[PDB]
Amino acid sequence: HHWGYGKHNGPEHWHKDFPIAKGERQSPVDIDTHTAKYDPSLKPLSVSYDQATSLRILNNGHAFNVEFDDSQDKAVLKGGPLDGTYRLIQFHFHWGSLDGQGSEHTVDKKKYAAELHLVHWNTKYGDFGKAVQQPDGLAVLGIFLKVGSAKPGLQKVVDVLDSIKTKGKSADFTNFDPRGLLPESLDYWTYPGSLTTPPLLECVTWIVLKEPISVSSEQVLKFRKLNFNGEGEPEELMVDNWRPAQPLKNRQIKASFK
Ligand SMILES: Cn1sc(=O)c2cc(S(N)(=O)=O)ccc21
Numbered sequence: 001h002h003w004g005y006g007k008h009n010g011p012e013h014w015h016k017d018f019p020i021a022k023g024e025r026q027s028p029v030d031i032d033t034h035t036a037k038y039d040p041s042l043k044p045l046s047v048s049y050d051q052a053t054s055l056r057i058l059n060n061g062h063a064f065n066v067e068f069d070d071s072q073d074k075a076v077l078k079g080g081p082l083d084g085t086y087r088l089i090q091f092h093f094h095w096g097s098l099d100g101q102g103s104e105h106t107v108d109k110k111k112y113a114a115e116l117h118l119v120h121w122n123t124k125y126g127d128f129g130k131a132v133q134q135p136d137g138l139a140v141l142g143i144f145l146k147v148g149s150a151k152p153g154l155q156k157v158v159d160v161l162d163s164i165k166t167k168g169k170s171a172d173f174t175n176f177d178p179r180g181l182l183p184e185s186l187d188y189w190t191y192p193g194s195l196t197t198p199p200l201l202e203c204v205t206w207i208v209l210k211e212p213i214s215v216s217s218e219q220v221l222k223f224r225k226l227n228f229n230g231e232g233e234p235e236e237l238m239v240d241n242w243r244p245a246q247p248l249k250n251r252q253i254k255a256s257f258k
C-alpha cells in the first residue's frame with residue numbers, strides 16, 4: 001500500500017513509488033562537524049516571528065502539524081544562506097520510541113530524541129505549491145530536542161494532543177508563539193537537501209541549528225501516545241516517524257561558526 005514508517009512501507013520502500021528517494025540531494029544527512037566548512041560570508045539568521053498567527057493543529061497520519069496563516073509576511077525567515085524572504089507555513093516533529101532516537105539529521109552520528117522542522121517557502125513563488133517546484137523553494141529550520149528540563153513553550157502543544165489522537169483529527173490552535181521553541185543561539189549548519197517524507201522533493205535549503213532545546217521526558221512521552229491510524233482502526237502508535245540519514249554525495253555542509 002502507501003508509505004509510512006512500518007516494516008512494509010517504511011523508508012527503504014519509498015523509492016518504488018518515488019524514484020527521487022535515491023537522488024543527489026536527499027535529506028536527512030549525518031552532519032560531520034569536523035568536515036563541515038566554516039563560511040564567514042554566511043550572514044546571521046533573521047527569524048521574525050513576532051506577528052506569527054497559528055490557526056490549527058492537525059494529525060495527518062505521519063505526524064502532527066501546527067499550521068500558520070501565510071497570506072502575508074507575518075512570520076518570516078531571512079538572511080543566513082537565504083536570498084529573499086520565506087514565510088512560515090507550518091511546523092512539525094519527528095520523534096522516536098526511545099529517548100535515544102527520533103531525530104532525522106544526526107551530529108557526528110549522534111541522534112537526538114526528536115527534531116522540530118519549521119517549514120518556510122520562498123515568497124517570490126507566490127504560494128507553497130509553486131515553491132515546491134523550485135530548487136530554492138523551501139527553507140526548513142531544523143531544531144534538535146534532547147530529554148532533560150521541560151520546555152515551557154512546548155506545553156501548550158503537548159496539552160492539545162489528546163484531541164488530535166487519530167489520523168484526520170484537527171483542532172483550533174490560535175495564539176501559539178513559535179518563539180518559545182528557539183534555542184538561545186542561532187548558530188547553524190546549512191546545506192541543500194529535500195523534503196524528508198514523500199514526495200521527497202529536492203527543493204530545500206536545510207538550516208540545522210547547533211544548539212538543541214531540552215524537553216522533559218513527560219513532554220516527549222505524550223508525543224508517543226498519538227496514533228498513525230484513523231479513528232476506528234487498529235491502534236498503531238505514532239513512533240519512529242524518522243527517515244535514516246542519506247548519502248551526502250556531491251554536497252558540502254557549511255557552518256556559520258567555528
Ligand atoms: C508534505 N509536506 S508539506 C511540508 O511543509 C513538508 C515538510 C516536510 S520535512 N519533514 O522535510 O520538513 C516533509 C513533507 C512536507
Ligand SMILES: [Zn+2]
Nearest residue numbers: 092094117196
Ligand atoms: Zn519534517
